Curated annotation (Swiss-Prot):
Disease listed for this protein: Rhabdomyolysis 1: An autosomal recessive disorder characterized by severe and recurrent rhabdomyolysis, usually with onset in the teenage years. Some of the episodes may be triggered by exercise or heat; others occur spontaneously. Rhabdomyolysis is the rapid breakdown of damaged or injured skeletal myofibres and may require intensive care management. Muscle breakdown results in release of myofibrillar content into the extracellular space and circulation, resulting in hyperCKemia (hyperCK) and myoglobinuria. A chromosomal aberration involving OBSCN has been found in Wilms tumor. Translocation t(1;7)(q42;p15) with PTHB1.
Function: Structural component of striated muscles which plays a role in myofibrillogenesis. Probably involved in the assembly of myosin into sarcomeric A bands in striated muscle. Has serine/threonine protein kinase activity and phosphorylates N-cadherin CDH2 and sodium/potassium-transporting ATPase subunit ATP1B1.
Full protein name: Obscurin
Assigned protein family: Belongs to the protein kinase superfamily. CAMK Ser/Thr protein kinase family.
Compartments reported by the entry: Cytoplasm, Myofibril, Sarcomere, M line; Cytoplasm, Myofibril, Sarcomere, Z line; Cell membrane, Sarcolemma; Nucleus
Free-text description of this protein's post-translational modifications in UniProt: Autophosphorylated by protein kinase domains 1 and 2.
Annotated consequence of substituting residue 67 to V: In a colorectal cancer sample; somatic mutation
Subunit structure: Interacts (via protein kinase domain 2) with CDH2 and (via protein kinase domain 1) with ATP1B1. Isoform 3 interacts with TTN/titin and calmodulin. Isoform 3 interacts with ANK1 isoform Mu17/ank1.5.
Name of the encoding gene: OBSCN
Residues of the full protein shown: 1071 to 1162 of 7968
Residue ranges of every copy of the Ig-like domain listed in the record: 2-92
Disulfide bond annotation, renumbered to this chain: 27-77
Origin superkingdom: Eukaryota
Protein's organism: Homo sapiens
Length: 95
C-alpha cells in the first residue's frame, strides 16, 4: 500500500473544443489498480498508430491530441466502482 495518491485525472464534466483540439480524459487508480473497461463513442481503441492510447504501469490514459469530428461523442469508463463522464462537443472547422 503506497501513499502516492495522484491528482484526480478522472474527469466528470461537459467541455467543448474545436477540430484537432486537445481532449484529455485520463483515469488513474491509486488504490487496488483494477483494470477498467473504457470506451468512447466513435473512437475504437487499437494499437497506437491512430489515436494516442498509452498503457500506464498503474492504470490507462486516453490522450487524444486531435479532438476531431469523428472523436465527438460521449465517453463512458467503468472503473472499479468509480466512473468517468466526459462529454466532448467538438467542432469541425478542420476536415
Amino acid at each position: 500500500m503506497k501513499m502516492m495518491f495522484a491528482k484526480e485525472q478522472s474527469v466528470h464534466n461537459e467541455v467543448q473544443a474545436e477540430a484537432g483540439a486537445s481532449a484529455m480524459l485520463s483515469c488513474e487508480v491509486a488504490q487496488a489498480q483494477t483494470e477498467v473497461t473504457w470506451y468512447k463513442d466513435g473512437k475504437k481503441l487499437s494499437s497506437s498508430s491512430k489515436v494516442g492510447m498509452e498503457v500506464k504501469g498503474c492504470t490507462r490514459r486516453l490522450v487524444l491530441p486531435q479532438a476531431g469530428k469523428a472523436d465527438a461523442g460521449e465517453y463512458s469508463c467503468e472503473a472499479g466502482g468509480q466512473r468517468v463522464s466526459f462529454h466532448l462537443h467538438i467542432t469541425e472547422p478542420l476536415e
